[PDB]
Amino acid sequence: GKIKIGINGFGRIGRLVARVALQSEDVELVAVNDPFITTDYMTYMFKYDTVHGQWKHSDIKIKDSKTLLLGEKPVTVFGIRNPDEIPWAEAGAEYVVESTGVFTDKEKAAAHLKGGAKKVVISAPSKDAPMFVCGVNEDKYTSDIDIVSNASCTTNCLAPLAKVIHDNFGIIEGLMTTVHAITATQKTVDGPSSKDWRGGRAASFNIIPSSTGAAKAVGKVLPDLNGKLTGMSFRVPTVDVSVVDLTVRIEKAASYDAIKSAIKSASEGKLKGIIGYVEEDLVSTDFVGDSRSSIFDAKAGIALNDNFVKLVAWYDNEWGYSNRVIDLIRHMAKTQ
Amino acid sequence: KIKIGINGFGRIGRLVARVALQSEDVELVAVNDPFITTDYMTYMFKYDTVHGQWKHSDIKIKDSKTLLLGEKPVTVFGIRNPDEIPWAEAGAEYVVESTGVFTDKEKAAAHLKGGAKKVVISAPSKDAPMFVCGVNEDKYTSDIDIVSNASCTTNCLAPLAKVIHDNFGIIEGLMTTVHAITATQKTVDGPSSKDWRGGRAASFNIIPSSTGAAKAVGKVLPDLNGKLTGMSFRVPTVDVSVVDLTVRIEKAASYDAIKSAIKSASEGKLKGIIGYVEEDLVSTDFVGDSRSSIFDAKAGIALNDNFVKLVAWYDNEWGYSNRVIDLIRHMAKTQ
Amino acid sequence: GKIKIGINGFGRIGRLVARVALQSEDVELVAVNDPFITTDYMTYMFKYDTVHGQWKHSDIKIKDSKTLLLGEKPVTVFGIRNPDEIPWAEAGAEYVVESTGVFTDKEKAAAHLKGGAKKVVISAPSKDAPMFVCGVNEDKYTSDIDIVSNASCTTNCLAPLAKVIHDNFGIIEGLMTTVHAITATQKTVDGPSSKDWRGGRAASFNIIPSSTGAAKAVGKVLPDLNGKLTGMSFRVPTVDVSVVDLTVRIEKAASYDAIKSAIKSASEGKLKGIIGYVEEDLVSTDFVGDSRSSIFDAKAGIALNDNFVKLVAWYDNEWGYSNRVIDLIRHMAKTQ
Amino acid sequence: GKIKIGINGFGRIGRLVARVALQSEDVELVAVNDPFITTDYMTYMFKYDTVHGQWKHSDIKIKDSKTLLLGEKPVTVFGIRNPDEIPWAEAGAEYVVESTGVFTDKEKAAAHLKGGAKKVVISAPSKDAPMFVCGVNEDKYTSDIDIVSNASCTTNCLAPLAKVIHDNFGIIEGLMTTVHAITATQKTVDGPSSKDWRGGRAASFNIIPSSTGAAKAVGKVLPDLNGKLTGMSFRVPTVDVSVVDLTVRIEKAASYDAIKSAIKSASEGKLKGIIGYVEEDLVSTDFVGDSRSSIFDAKAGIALNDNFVKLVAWYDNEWGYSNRVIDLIRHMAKTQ
Numbered sequence A, C, D: 001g002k003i004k005i006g007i008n009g010f011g012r013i014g015r016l017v018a019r020v021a022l023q024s025e026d027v028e029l030v031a032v033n034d035p036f037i038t039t040d041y042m043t044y045m046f047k048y049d050t051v052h053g054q055w056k057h058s059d060i061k062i063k064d065s066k067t068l069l070l071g072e073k074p075v076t077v078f079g080i081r082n083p084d085e086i087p088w089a090e091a092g093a094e095y096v097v098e099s100t101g102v103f104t105d106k107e108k109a110a111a112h113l114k115g116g117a118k119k120v121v122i123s124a125p126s127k128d129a130p131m132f133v134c135g136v137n138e139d140k141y142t143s144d145i146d147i148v149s150n151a152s153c154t155t156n157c158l159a160p161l162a163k164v165i166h167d168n169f170g171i172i173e174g175l176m177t178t179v180h181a182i183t184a185t186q187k188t189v190d191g192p193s194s195k196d197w198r199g200g201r202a203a204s205f206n207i208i209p210s211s212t213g214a215a216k217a218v219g220k221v222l223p224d225l226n227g228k229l230t231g232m233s234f235r236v237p238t239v240d241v242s243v244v245d246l247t248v249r250i251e252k253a254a255s256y257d258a259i260k261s262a263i264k265s266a267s268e269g270k271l272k273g274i275i276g277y278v279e280e281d282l283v284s285t286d287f288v289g290d291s292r293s294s295i296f297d298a299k300a301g302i303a304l305n306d307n308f309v310k311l312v313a314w315y316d317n318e319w320g321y322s323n324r325v326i327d328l329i330r331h332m333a334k335t336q
Numbered sequence B: 001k002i003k004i005g006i007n008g009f010g011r012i013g014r015l016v017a018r019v020a021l022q023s024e025d026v027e028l029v030a031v032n033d034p035f036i037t038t039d040y041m042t043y044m045f046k047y048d049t050v051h052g053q054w055k056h057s058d059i060k061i062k063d064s065k066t067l068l069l070g071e072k073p074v075t076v077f078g079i080r081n082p083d084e085i086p087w088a089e090a091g092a093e094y095v096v097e098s099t100g101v102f103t104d105k106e107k108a109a110a111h112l113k114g115g116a117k118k119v120v121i122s123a124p125s126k127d128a129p130m131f132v133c134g135v136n137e138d139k140y141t142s143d144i145d146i147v148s149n150a151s152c153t154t155n156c157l158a159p160l161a162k163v164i165h166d167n168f169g170i171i172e173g174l175m176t177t178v179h180a181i182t183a184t185q186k187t188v189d190g191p192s193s194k195d196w197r198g199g200r201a202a203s204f205n206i207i208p209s210s211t212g213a214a215k216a217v218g219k220v221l222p223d224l225n226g227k228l229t230g231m232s233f234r235v236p237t238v239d240v241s242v243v244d245l246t247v248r249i250e251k252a253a254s255y256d257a258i259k260s261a262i263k264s265a266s267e268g269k270l271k272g273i274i275g276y277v278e279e280d281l282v283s284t285d286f287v288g289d290s291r292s293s294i295f296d297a298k299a300g301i302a303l304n305d306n307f308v309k310l311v312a313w314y315d316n317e318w319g320y321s322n323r324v325i326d327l328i329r330h331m332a333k334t335q
């Protein structure tokens, strides 16, 4: 080991990927860049979390103007806006997590290579960097690629479920709806959002529809499913945890029980850790802190017939995805 | 000149009263609720968290058993059993059964003992004839004294499905409703014997729930019996819900063809029942909308010409309350 | 014969100040500037509102890139960043409502005079522009003052109440707490807020303590109270409508009924329309749309004794204030 | 050996008092009564919680329809409405936690004795049963008392704070305000609530004033402060964690720093575990899970002068209080 990483954008995903790395045995966080959060403010934002509780694993302290100590393990802090000016090499950061939400293009994210980084993992979909979803197509990653995308948390939820359903029963066509928690891009009160008008309306007092390429993106990581899936979303007044509502038409007829057995076995086999399976009366909060990418809700789903069903799968959009960012880094690091 | 009474002065009861009191043809003459005194009733009727204060008329008490809406008298009852309510004394011909505990045909029929002539159950009934305005209210016959106006969800789903089925032919469909919280839910994790998920804190959880609204469409549109079903997700909003209907259709149709069909329907026969919008609206923009189903053109999406996802809004409280009154109007015109 | 005004910053307050003007008999909105809201987006943001309902008093349309049509009446639209670059006189705007939140300094707010504007009303506290509060000290205004502040929504609620109490009973000292709805400066989720750390935390899932000079500002508009009042604030998960909680030790002993009586008298007299009086079991949503600056809740308060009492007054922080912005302009227009 | 307790009313407090017992080393939960929660349903309500996470401390099994298995320890389950009919003795429950909220009268709670219980601790204020607050007057308890009250969560937060301020500076008089999270007695939508009209209004969409004698109650556990304190509450849209806002006029002049010091000193000494002290930018969710009764927030408070100040103290109305119920039981058992 240890695998040395840096994080650009110490936000919801940035801070949680830090918790995952800090709690790991094989990954070492060595640097964090965010020009909007000072070293001092960084210890506060990292220690306290409205959703995932207070950090109690180690002690948080400031060594100096730009060095955090987690315990004492040292973490360099940067406050640079331009990625091509971040000296990642100085801190030994081999892998950089691009979780700012503004450098998703391959060309922008590649700016990190200038300061000495060897690999960059974009914490969101990318238009030109290849996307990988763990448990679905991460084995397609080749080490000659230096900039990749870990897709969206929604694709990480739907992709695993669709692969199981497709492998077992064959998917003819499917439509997805995700009841999604509010996020950083939304507004507390009605305000401007030029590219997403509905997105500008007060987040916690409205059900706000939105478009999403998360379902269609499944066709990129699973080519056989190209053009057979798409969907949309409804952002709702909850702080975290979202759910996928997949309406699918399958080729091979199968009872609901049959579908439940296929998912259960997958959650216990090759996709253990990625896809979960519950059969209780759970609600959103019960999934806070769940590290799986997709937790199938057995009792919530409903079948119209043996070839037309609606499947339900939860996902802690912040926690599960953050764990997948790390898992993808772990796999890239084990490649070759 | 239609005289009505309301049993259960709750969310639906109070709003149905607002519609009636603001109507020219309907007259509320009596209200019954054992858990709300006459004085408290004036407060619960005047102030509303979501539909604003009532200023249409002055609200005052005359006596302990009589309210005055500006200048019209409204008798107040506090009876527990429906078969003890002297509806006729107040001259109430139609009784809106909105308590939520008397949906059985035989239980609602209790209002007839007090002299009521017809009863309209503000909810689905296991055995009472069901009618949805704009869908099958014309199947109503004057010999029927007890009917169901179905659920707000079914009122949203039914009209829409009828338009798509008649134009395009729905082979199969699955619906999900993102629904506002209601009175049956809890503020904090509490006991809900018949619905565990529903006992969990209402405004701090996405809460899955089962719904018969989709299956009930089969009762008002026979050709869709067994062709639809679904579920629901209760979310942290105070009112206004939305139906997401995914359907496979017989006749191939572009999304634009589907939009115009709905738009046409909204400007014709179903005008006032089904609405059509093509703006970036959100939930609160629908508070106070009297339609049963408001199609969101921009929210919906189609995978191909035979498989699509349609989105329709509905103020579960206000639109339904209006339908309750519309059914009464229709029944009253039925010889 | 109308007072021609313009609005810089088409936000919560700018948009509602616009609703008030458009429906008035004496003020005419002739121009609005907001570099973040295009002309067509402006018609959408103005028409629909999560808290105050849809605009139905008149039709809304776009005459041209650059002109709106509010019930057959034209409103010029600008999208200029720098205030000194706004051609207000072109639109004929005599009064400018500075509601962007970023130009509260008297010398920054004065940039509007460059474009031909004659008077500027800052919709917020100002460190160097004088503050006036309707019902408290607006008559102190003289026509040679060209830049003024309408204070804060909280001071507009606190000032009138404090005045009545002080004039009748004499305030020895007081401490205020405002349980305030969330606003645009807050975040949907745990986000950066360098000047107000607490204010960065998820808005609708936390009680959030906050500093405020609203009680201290009372000294500016009411000299004899200078230094005798101060306070704090808690931001809670509501969309609009706030409440002031004033605890005061008074010089003249008075029963709670006598205190209630003084406030009622004022609400029916000199302070009608500014201070309101309620004796019913109301809650926050019952005040949405109330135009008063301070609605005294007679039942919610409690006195420990005849010289120490806790008084409660509600205020639609958005609507009440917006109406006061207009009332101040009307007053200034009548001066000299 | 172990203090064997029984719980009547498996609600928020009842279930969290159970978690505390089940995690202690000295307390043994042996019986639970709740006629509205079946034995099977009980495991589900006990295991998952919207606020305090999933119970992971020990496994949960159902031995049969009358008993649960928690970490191999049997817990009898009753479903009896009338308290006088619960055979506490049969289970071995010595102390009974009366947490239904309907049997707070001394004579009504005494019903638990006819079934075999020796002591009854009511988890709410009582009109006549002796009230005790750990760290304030729990030593006033005498073995001849079999039925006591552990006061309210609010009085538990305020009393310890007032005791410290009074012992150090002397409290001449004070007025309190509590910004409180919603509770089970409130309603999801505007519904009937005859004894509390405001409390019938939509809980998560309104700021709801409410009366409260939690402040007047301090004079009960703290005789010297009788008639020196009172106040009221504001229920707001949060799921848990409330805060006390105390405005007090003190006798001995003290700078804010000296007051902070006195509180920090008490939090590290005699009142350790009861009173807490924080000097950071925290928000409500940061206190979820805190076991103290009162957490002083140094930075949130403000002083007008050395004799008139506003003190802020947080409390997880659910958790802090549940821990104190166990502590009161511990003290009673230790003073048999």
Ligand SMILES: NC(=O)c1ccc[n+]([C@@H]2O[C@H](COP(=O)([O-])OP(=O)(O)OC[C@H]3O[C@@H](n4cnc5c(N)ncnc54)[C@H](O)[C@@H]3O)[C@@H](O)[C@H]2O)c1
Binding pocket: A008, A009, A010, A011, A012, A013, A014, A033, A034, A035, A036, A037, A080, A081, A082, A099, A100, A101, A102, A123, A124, A152, A153, A183, A184, A185, A317, A318, A321, C190, C191, C192
């Ligand atoms: N929140 C989720 O549920 C979720 C799940 C999966 C993927 N994502 C994706 O992760 C990304 C970040 O999402 P988030 O919710 O954590 O956002 P966020 O807003 O919480 O965090 C983004 C961080 O980027 C920082 N930042 C801004 N400009 C910067 C710059 N030039 N250099 C360095 N740092 C900068 C910000 O100060 C902020 O702390 C987005 O692309 C998002 O779509 C989010």
Ligand SMILES: NC(=O)c1ccc[n+]([C@@H]2O[C@H](COP(=O)([O-])OP(=O)(O)OC[C@H]3O[C@@H](n4cnc5c(N)ncnc54)[C@H](O)[C@@H]3O)[C@@H](O)[C@H]2O)c1
Binding pocket: B007, B008, B009, B010, B011, B012, B013, B032, B033, B034, B035, B036, B079, B080, B081, B098, B099, B100, B101, B122, B123, B150, B151, B152, B182, B183, B316, B317, B320, D190, D191, D192
């Ligand atoms: N709220 C909605 O969105 C909605 C929409 C459509 C249909 N419905 C249906 O309407 C019914 C009521 O729903 P709601 O949300 O208005 O509920 P609610 O709880 O707000 O109102 C029900 C009222 O019934 C009263 N009541 C109880 N027992 C009574 C009795 N024996 N006699 C007289 N009155 C009595 C209550 O005191 C209460 O005021 C239910 O069957 C519900 O499923 C609700």
Ligand SMILES: NC(=O)c1ccc[n+]([C@@H]2O[C@H](COP(=O)([O-])OP(=O)(O)OC[C@H]3O[C@@H](n4cnc5c(N)ncnc54)[C@H](O)[C@@H]3O)[C@@H](O)[C@H]2O)c1
Binding pocket: A190, A191, A192, C008, C009, C010, C011, C012, C013, C014, C033, C034, C035, C036, C037, C080, C081, C082, C099, C100, C101, C102, C123, C124, C151, C152, C153, C183, C184, C185, C317, C318, C321
């Ligand atoms: N919302 C309230 O409760 C309230 C009440 C009283 C006073 N205020 C004060 O009013 C001001 C605005 O508050 P708000 O809640 O309406 O804020 P907001 O964020 O809703 O609106 C501010 C508007 O300013 C625009 N803007 C930004 N930069 C600009 C520029 N250079 N030129 C022109 N427009 C620009 C934005 O695009 C936005 O639409 C603040 O100073 C605030 O303190 C707010």
Ligand SMILES: NC(=O)c1ccc[n+]([C@@H]2O[C@H](COP(=O)([O-])OP(=O)(O)OC[C@H]3O[C@@H](n4cnc5c(N)ncnc54)[C@H](O)[C@@H]3O)[C@@H](O)[C@H]2O)c1
Binding pocket: B189, B190, B191, D008, D009, D010, D011, D012, D013, D014, D033, D034, D035, D036, D037, D080, D081, D082, D099, D100, D101, D102, D123, D124, D151, D152, D153, D154, D183, D184, D185, D317, D318, D321
């Ligand atoms: N934050 C808080 O919620 C808090 C803090 C301090 C004190 N308290 C007090 O604790 C008590 C309970 O409050 P809660 O919030 O836990 O309420 P809750 O409604 O969550 O729980 C009460 C439980 O009592 C059960 N119950 C009802 N009648 C019963 C009977 N006859 N026999 C046995 N069980 C019965 C219910 O089924 C329910 O599970 C109240 O007196 C309250 O004032 C509450």
